[PDB]
Design a protein around this ligand. Structure first.
Ligand SMILES: *[C@@H]1O[C@H](CO)[C@@H](O[C@@H]2O[C@H](CO)[C@@H](O[C@@H]3O[C@H](CO[C@H]4O[C@H](CO)[C@@H](O)[C@H](O[C@H]5O[C@H](CO)[C@@H](O)[C@H](O)[C@@H]5O)[C@@H]4O)[C@@H](O)[C@H](O[C@H]4O[C@H](CO)[C@@H](O)[C@H](O)[C@@H]4O)[C@@H]3O)[C@H](O)[C@H]2NC(C)=O)[C@H](O)[C@H]1NC(C)=O
Ligand SMILES: *[C@@H]1O[C@H](CO)[C@@H](O[C@@H]2O[C@H](CO)[C@@H](O[C@@H]3O[C@H](CO[C@H]4O[C@H](CO)[C@@H](O)[C@H](O[C@H]5O[C@H](CO)[C@@H](O)[C@H](O)[C@@H]5O)[C@@H]4O)[C@@H](O)[C@H](O[C@H]4O[C@H](CO)[C@@H](O)[C@H](O)[C@@H]4O)[C@@H]3O)[C@H](O)[C@H]2NC(C)=O)[C@H](O)[C@H]1NC(C)=O
Ligand SMILES: CCCCCCCC(=O)OC[C@H](COP(=O)(O)O[C@@H]1[C@H](O)[C@H](O)[C@@H](OP(=O)(O)O)[C@H](OP(=O)(O)O)[C@H]1O)OC(=O)CCCCCCC
Ligand SMILES: CCCCCCCC(=O)OC[C@H](COP(=O)(O)O[C@@H]1[C@H](O)[C@H](O)[C@@H](OP(=O)(O)O)[C@H](OP(=O)(O)O)[C@H]1O)OC(=O)CCCCCCC
Lengths: 330, 343, 121, 334, 336, 344
């Protein structure tokens, strides 16, 4: 019965030939369920996505007449049917799944419409603009097209309920958060013909709770640790010197981990600008005490204790106002 | 020679692209899992490796034989020429069908056509973790598996013996560093897709982290850093560089401990319990050096005291801090280690 | 201190099993070898066995002598067979790491004392 | 000469069902094994596993391969092992193994005129260990390799170590950089499951750790840093910055040593022996600074209300206490 | 429309011997080459490699695949590339590469009715290029890719870049986080191996290292630590616990810079050019501490025997910033 | 056209499962290696990487033909259809036969049946090391390949030409960071496996470590730390916190250098040469602080000499002795160390 149908569908079927090979571009309707956007690699500029990638097309060499009306088949038929060579244009480690069987499926209705759905995991590249670090946002794309068939041979098209987001609460979005979804349709011009490139965009805003409890709080409080010296006496020169130089050593230690939190960009990020401003503050405090101790003891400066007690916390709060407002809101 | 004829009778026209009882019934597949070694739970990927014997049995009328044996034990080569259900793991990342030295699959046909198709898998299964009590937490890591092409009205999965006695772990193969296994919980559910409705088995594992690592690597170093900062209060008040060195190094020590205790965690964007403890202990140490600045505003006498003019007092906020800071630190330890050891 | 102390006789009509029982250092990694020194200041490479059970033989002795190490007892055992009168010479137990080795005598940094094995025809 | 051999091989395998155990309704096959260990590559405490390279070999008498007339043993190309029966032996301790591929897939088939066939594999596996590191790094680690038939039960297949105690060879040729193999045992036992009783074999070592590496890296600088904590006793109570700086710098040095050892080692819940020793040395180092706080408080605080007697007593107490602690420590574990 | 195409394809593949190149006793087959680069993923100085994801295309004509009548360029499924001849080109620089396999294997077969066939792969390779680090981190290391047939000599196969000035496209749209690709050169040549002479193409792109990571990480804190070593010239000579602790914590900070800048890097057996600068800055700090040892031994040791402290201090304040300026002068004019 | 039926006539009466001349004689395989690039020698794994174009040649009488050509330069599919010796590297760990873009294998058939079969391999080979002169050592890294199933009675290996000229290391492919390549050593051996005797070819690549990295990163830091801890004497004896901070910080510096230099290495049980150097330099810096404790036991006053002149302290005697004693002992140790180990 059904075996007779399947053997009639493969009697003279050639999977090397696209449907409508000299007739018209084969319109393919692509559907996609996103299970999880995994951990976004800020260093390698990647992200893991886990999709259920569905395709439909009309294959009019697969018409049949029956009462069965639908052939809900295994993955075993996939190698016997023309399957569109949909690759991902910005993938780097694109895996299918193979446990326990191939995770493909195939459903053929009587008119020639073929459902095809497979599970994928994709380390997809996105160019991370790491200005406003760590206060930025990205739209990390995910593209696909056919590899060998041009626009004149395969045209892709979204369905209506195109990209179906899951429940968003079992994802591994650590520092980021899902805020947007935006599909598109465009045509690239490669050397070997022109192709129809679908693309999904994922708008991602940022979460501000990691770098608060790692870099902001320790760098600011160790700047205040340097300020402790100004309530501490002028006579005890080794104590003040130890305060200043060990806080310098502490900032030099923290600057390493501040750059370690990011791929080695060739400019200065906003995080590292803050760290560098903090290091210049501790530098200026130690140079201030050296100038103080030379002008007084080694032979006004006699109020420059009390001048620095007022100037340095106020200048740091003015810099906090300028930095935090201009790099959060502006 | 006889059994070769039997197997050739079985594989006469056997289309392995048809569910057994395709238009007749709904296929009842009996699954069973034997966990050999519940492997290392990666926090930094939020996953867990598990190594299972994955049994699944069903009834196939197309494979009836009447020969000398009731049950014939097969090579796995015939198991590619026979329908097997497309059972996949929903929360599976990158899992291993073992192929040493052969593909580790068995297939046993009883004479009434009831198959038993087991394989050995190493499964890097996903587990979403709530780290709001890190590291005084429990977890519920699932094993979600169903069929990929067949719906609820085509295949139905069950458990073989009982629900609660199916997923049985081994007794010798624990293979957990940080975690207790506080028993498993099985459950059957239904996942509705746009393509249809799908029978989905689940099995939750209940993992509690053993606490002693972070006790001896994070908690006790921060406790004794605070005690080391409170050592400075039992000096005099004239030794300005001495108490300066005490306070500055203990602040530096708390910063180092803060970073090197966070490094054992995924970058969650909120405060864990360890974050609360390290921040409060950092506040104690920082308050101690603010206290020395408070004393050093009041100094007035650069000379120390002799064993034999005027001299300098004991600066009674020294006494008040010696009573206060160990008392406040001990009260906070009581509050901490009675709060989070019940959540 | 590393000692490479030999055994076995030195006079034959025959066959002979010249051993070399080491102490002080496990030479499993090392390539333990036997050298023949004819009168004429000529150290000649007879046989040597690698750590991976690989027998290297000299050109004059290819197919006559059998070398066999016991890695438990840290020894090397050159079996003698088909003994011509031209094998009257001194047999050294050697050991080394063969840098620019297995064909040179300077590559070995540990030595036996030697044994004269004399053939009377 | 040669076409007769081809004719003999082609009439062996025509009419040879490879999905059938030998004597398929009758007695179990006695599959005999042989392991020639090339090396053990790494023994990782971080991942609790070890990489084992071996020449894993199997004999069994397949009665459907018994040729005649040819006086030699048929050593064939490795690709004819696809057209034979082979046992489905696996490893339970295995994590990620591979038969080597360069320059071919390293198989051998050596047929015999009685029908005996040898199947040899160069397998580089990665077997797991439940490492009990409480006595680290002064421990005897036991690590196994559990060979077992997958599908065929004990009624279909039997495993014997061929050669008794001399099946597994090449153990003595292994020079691990930081271990030392004491014993290997060869256990043959049947294992029950839900599906039946299967034959299991067990090659199983005992890795004893060499102890000099940690004396060089960790123990000896810990001893010398704990000794240099005691320079403060030979410094006046007046010199405050001197005793405070050496006491602060020695708690910093012990901190750096312990941070390096926590970066090396896995995430274990208990307290290891090297951690017991560093906790003990940090107790001595911390008490060597509590002593100065005690001296400073007694002199400058309880002054107007002995001092040098504390130093004279502690110069005798602390070396005696430290030698007593090392005595109890190194007689508990060694 | 379909039966005729199927008849032409099955006529072409029938009798087509894939163990034979075109013109197997005749002329060498001319293979066109064409690369579109997706990205250069990483360039590791540790592993001396660079990961390269590209679109790799090969034209050649094949007179056993000439079909008449149909005006199409027949694009077949990629599973017919197991049934055709292809040039067995390797990459000599290759460590570890793979053709991507989602959702199928990325091949194309675009048969042209004169026998020309495009065979395009999608390759992520990990090629190995040596890195002369004598001018790190100001170096412009050159990395090459070498494309070459394996089994066919120069008398069997010939390569060429197709449009040899503009064969490699997409060099500009590579955005490396550390490097800027200044230029790329296409060079065709042979080699002589022991078996025969083989045609080889080279796709090498020069790479200037951008230096802003090192100004922010290494150079500027070395300058500021070197200057903070000189606070202890405007400190009185009686303050031993000031000047000594200052210079000691300064050599500690230079040591902790050296720790991370030996951790980040390969174990090359010479002076990295980042080591000339840091060793020189360590010498300045070391001489700033030797100055106090010199002052203390002159004053407190050669004192009662009875030439100045303040003269040496004034001389050091004049000399050491002038000396460090000369050092930066020589350092930033030697390399740049 | 013609070559199709030639190749069909070859594969008519052919089996690829049995050795050419199985019951007649041995199969002389003439091996050859072209080392393109000798890759980086991982000390921590005690391994190295090598990439070689692996030539083999033998004579098969069944593959005689006559036709228009002498040699058939072919596709590797027919090389998979023809007997091929199962050569395996005896010390390979995880070795990769490259197949980008096709399997890099050439089969050439000359008309008298003399096959040529070259592969392109990357062999992650196992080099056992003796690091007792670390880093000033040198050792032979071997590369050993034999058949896996064929004994001496069945397949015998040779080299194509004379052995020391056969294995060729190409010049552009250095790919070494630390080590230098001083030359190879081409040989031949026999094993005694349980199965039987086998022929084992052997090349021993000889590698001497450049110590420039280790001098820069370990020796000059330890030397300059000791120079510092001996500069402490030229202060006066009364600056107790100056010399105290000085001595314990240089001790911390030597402890840091100790662990961070031993990290670049496996975990062997003995002490290497750099361990002897670090331990002796750490003993100097330890003895400097014990020296200052010995100074401070005999201080007897609290102040130092003012520039305008009560009693005073003299410069102590063990200070004046140690100013010359310890740098002289350090110079003696440097002479003995760098004359002992640059001999080997
Ligand atoms: C590392 O860690 C592993 C795991 O802990 C250690 O492995 C264990 O080693 C011991 C000692 O070598 C093993 O015991 C031996 O078992 C063998 C096999 O016997 C089995 O098969 C028999 C049939 O062939 C069967 O009769 C046996 O059943 C008996 O024992 C069971 C026990 O439950 C009992 O239920 C039955 O009623 C029987 O009484 C069993 O299934 C056995 O041959 C050995 O006996 C010899 O040695 C003993 C003395 O030790 C002597 O009394 C006997 O006469 C005989 O000479 C012995 O019992 C054990 O099986 C291993 N366990 C595992 C899990 O592998 C290993 O030793 C550790 N160290 C090292 C260095 O590797
Ligand atoms: C990175 O590093 C790599 C390697 O160092 C650089 O690659 C080198 O690039 C240069 C070009 O910039 C190459 O030189 C070219 O070589 C080719 C060879 O062409 C051949 O065919 C000729 C016939 O058509 C034949 O005559 C040639 O034979 C000559 O040269 C060989 C040696 O190659 C010699 O043995 C013979 O005796 C002959 O003398 C050869 O077989 C050549 O075509 C180029 O010549 C042209 O350009 C020059 C001007 O540049 C002009 O003068 C000529 O008239 C002609 O127009 C050119 O000489 C070099 O071979 C490459 N080396 C390697 C190892 O590949 C790469 O450039 C670097 N890139 C970066 C980022 O800078
Ligand atoms: C974080 C702590 C913040 C503390 C902030 C505290 C800020 C603050 O203002 O402190 C003032 C004082 C500490 O002063 P302190 O004891 O250090 O200094 C004495 C004080 O100046 C006296 O007035 C002097 O007495 P007199 O005139 O010569 O007779 C005495 O001189 P002498 O004896 O040397 O001759 C000085 O030593 O404390 C309190 O009064 C209770 C505060 C309880 C605070 C309890 C805090 C736990
Ligand atoms: C690690 C070394 C350990 C050495 C342990 C050595 C322990 C030991 O026995 O020290 C004693 C002495 C220390 O002498 P040092 O110069 O340090 O101290 C002087 C000494 O105390 C005089 O006795 C004092 O004078 P006086 O007469 O009382 O008025 C003098 O007072 P002042 O007038 O200046 O104020 C002090 O300065 O050293 C040696 O004799 C050389 C030993 C060389 C030993 C060399 C060993 C290498």
């Amino acid at each position: 019965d059904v075996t007779v149908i399947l053997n009639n569908l493969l009697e003279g079927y050639d999977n090397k030939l696209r449907p409508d090979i000299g007739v018209k571009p084969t319109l393919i309707h692509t559907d996609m369920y996103v299970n999880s956007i995994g951990p976004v690699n800020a260093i390698n500029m990647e992200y893991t996505i886990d999709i259920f990638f569905a395709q439909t097309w009309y294959d009019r060499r697969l018409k049949f007449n029956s009462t069965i009306k639908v052939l809900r088949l295994n993955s075993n038929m996939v190698g016997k049917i023309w399957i569109p060579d949909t690759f991902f244009r910005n993938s780097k480690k694109a895996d299918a799944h193979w446990i326990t069987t191939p995770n493909r499926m195939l459903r053929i209705w009587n008119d020639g419409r073929v459902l095809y759905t497979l599970r994928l995991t994709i380390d997809a590249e996105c160019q991370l603009q790491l200005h406003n670090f760590p206060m930025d946002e990205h739209s990390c794309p995910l593209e696909f097209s056919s590899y060998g068939y041009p626009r004149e041979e395969i045209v892709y098209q979204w369905k209506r309920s195109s990209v179906e987001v899951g429940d968003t609460r079992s994802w591994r979005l650590y520092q980021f958060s899902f805020v947007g979804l935006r599909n598109t349709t465009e045509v690239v011009k490669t050397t070997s013909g022109d192709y129809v490139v679908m693309s999904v965009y994922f708008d991602l805003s940022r979460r501000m709770g990691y770098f608060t409890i790692q870099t902001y709080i320790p760098c600011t409080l160790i700047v205040v640790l340097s300020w402790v010296s100004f309530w501490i006496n002028k006579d005890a020169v080794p104590a003040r010197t130890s305060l200043g130089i060990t806080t310098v050593l502490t900032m030099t230690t923290l600057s390493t981990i501040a750059r370690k939190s990011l791929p080695k960009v060739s400019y200065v990020t906003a995080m590292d600008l803050f760290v560098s401003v903090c290091f210049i503050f501790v530098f200026s405090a130690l140079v201030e005490y050296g100038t103080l101790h030379y002008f007084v003891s080694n032979r006004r400066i006699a109020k420059m204790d009390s001048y620095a007690r007022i100037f340095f916390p106020t200048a740091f709060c003015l810099f906090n106002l300028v930095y935090w407002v201009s790099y959060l809101y502006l | 020679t006889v059994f070769t004829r039997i197997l050739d009778r079985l594989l006469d026209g056997y289309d392995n692209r048809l569910r057994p009882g395709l238009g007749e019934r709904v296929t009842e597949v009996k699954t069973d899992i034997f966990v050999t070694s519940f492997g290392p739970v990666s926090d930094h990927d939020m996953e867990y490796t598990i190594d299972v014997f994955f049994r699944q049995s069903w009834k196939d009328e197309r494979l009836k034989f009447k020969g000398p044996m009731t049950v014939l034990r097969l090579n796995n080569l015939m198991a590619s020429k026979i329908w097997t259900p497309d059972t996949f793991f929903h929360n599976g990342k990158k899992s291993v069908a073992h192929n040493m030295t052969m593909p580790n699959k068995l297939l046993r046909i009883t004479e009434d056509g009831t198959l038993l198709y087991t394989m050995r898998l190493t499964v890097r299964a996903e587990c979403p973790m709530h780290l709001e009590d890190f590291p005084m937490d429990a977890h519920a890591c699932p094993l979600k598996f169903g069929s990929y092409a067949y719906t609820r009205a085509e295949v139905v999965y069950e458990w073989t013996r009982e629900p609660a006695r199916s997923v049985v772990v081994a007794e010798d193969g624990s293979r957990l560093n940080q975690y207790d296994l506080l028993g498993q919980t099985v459950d059957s559910g239904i996942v509705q897709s746009s393509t249809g409705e799908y029978v989905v088995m689940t099995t939750h594992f209940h993992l509690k982290r053993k606490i002693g690592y972070f006790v001896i690597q994070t908690y006790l170093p921060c406790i004794m850093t605070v005690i080391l900062s409170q050592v400075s209060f039992w000096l005099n008040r004239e030794s300005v560089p001495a108490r300066t060195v005490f306070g500055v190094t203990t602040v530096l020590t708390m910063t180092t401990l803060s970073i090197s205790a966070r490094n054992s965690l995924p970058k969650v964007a909120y405060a864990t319990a360890m974050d609360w403890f390290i921040a409060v202990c950092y506040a104690f140490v920082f308050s101690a050096l603010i206290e020395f600045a408070t004393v050093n505003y009041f100094t007035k006498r650069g000379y120390a005291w002799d064993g034999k003019k005027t001299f300098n007092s004991v600066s009674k906020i020294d006494r008040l801090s010696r009573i206060a800071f160990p008392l406040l630190f001990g009260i906070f330890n009581l509050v901490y280690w009675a709060t989070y050891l019940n959540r | 201190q590393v000692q490479l102390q030999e055994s076995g006789g030195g006079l034959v009509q025959g066959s002979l099993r010249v051993s070399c029982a080491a102490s002080g250092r496990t030479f499993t990694t090392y390539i333990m070898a036997w050298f023949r020194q004819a009168p004429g200041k000529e150290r000649e490479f007879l046989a040597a066995m690698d750590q991976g059970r690989i027998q290297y033989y000299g050109d004059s002795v290819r197919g006559r002598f059998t070398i066999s190490r016991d890695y438990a007892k840290n020894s090397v055992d050159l079996q003698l067979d088909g003994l011509r009168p031209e094998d009257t010479a001194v047999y050294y137990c050697a050991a080394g790491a063969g840098f620019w080795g297995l064909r040179t005598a300077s590559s070995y940094h540990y030595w036996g004392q030697g044994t004269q094995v004399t053939v009377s025809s | 000469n040669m076409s007769f051999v081809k004719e003999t091989v082609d009439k062996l395998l025509k009419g040879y069902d490879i999905r059938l155990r030998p004597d398929f309704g009758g007695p179990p096959v006695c599959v005999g094994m042989n392991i020639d260990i090339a090396s053990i590559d790494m023994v990782s405490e971080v991942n609790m596993d070890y990489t084992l390279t071996m020449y894993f070999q199997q004999y069994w008498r397949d009665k459907r391969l018994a040729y005649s007339g040819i006086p030699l043993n048929l050593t064939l190309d490795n690709r004819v092992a696809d057209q034979l029966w082979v046992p489905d032996t696996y490893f339970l301790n295995d994590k990620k193994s591979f038969v080597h591929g360069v320059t071919v897939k390293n198989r051998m088939i050596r047929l015999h005129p009685d029908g005996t066939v040898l199947y040899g594999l160069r397998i580089t596996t990665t077997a797991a260990c439940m490492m009990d590191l409480r006595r680290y790094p002064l421990d005897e680690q036991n690590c196994t390799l559990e060979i077992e038939s997958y599908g065929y039960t004990t009624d279909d297949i039997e495993f014997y170590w061929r050669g008794g105690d001399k099946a597994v060879t090449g153990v003595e040729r292994i020079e691990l950089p930081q271990f030392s193999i004491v014993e290997h045992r060869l256990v043959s036992r049947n294992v029950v499951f839900a599906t039946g009783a299967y034959p299991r074999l067990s090659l199983s070592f005992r890795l004893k750790r060499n102890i000099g590496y940690f004396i060089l890296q960790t123990y000896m600088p810990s001893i010398l840093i704990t000794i240099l904590s005691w320079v403060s006793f030979w410094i006046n109570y007046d010199a405050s910055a001197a005793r405070v700086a050496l006491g602060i710098t020695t708690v910093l040095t012990m901190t750096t040593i312990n941070t390096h050892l926590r970066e090396t080692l896995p995430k274990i819940p208990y307290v290891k022996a090297i951690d017991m020793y560093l906790m003990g040395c940090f107790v001595f180092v911390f008490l060597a600074l509590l002593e100065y706080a005690f001296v400073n408080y007694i002199f400058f605080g309880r002054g107007p209300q002995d001092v040098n007697a504390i130093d004279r007593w502690s110069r005798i107490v602390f070396p005696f206490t430290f030698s007593l602690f090392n005595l109890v420590y190194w007689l508990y574990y060694v």
